[PDB]
Symmetry: C2
Subunit: 43 residues, 2 copies
């Protein structure tokens, strides 16, 4: 019953497909997508 | 300079992982990103 936000981009759980929770942080699917580009070094 | 940065999700330092991606006062390593992929894709 509270708005949760991606710690990287700031979007809430209501703006993304999925919001993954760490111990005290969160990351959305869009940022994970971006992380893959960074790690794989590809577009 | 010289300071240890940790993945905010698993706690590993930048010397324990391949890459540590930085956000605003938050970090995530390549291993946790791999896990996130399994979570999003809902597969193993
Ligand atoms: Ca040091
Ligand atoms: Zn995000
Ligand atoms: Zn990690």
């Amino acid at each position: 019953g509270k708005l949760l936000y991606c710690s990287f981009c700031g979007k809430s759980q209501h703006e993304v497909r999925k919001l993954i929770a760490g111990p005290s942080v969160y990351i959305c699917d869009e940022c994970v997508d971006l992380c893959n580009d960074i790690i794989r070094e590809e577009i």
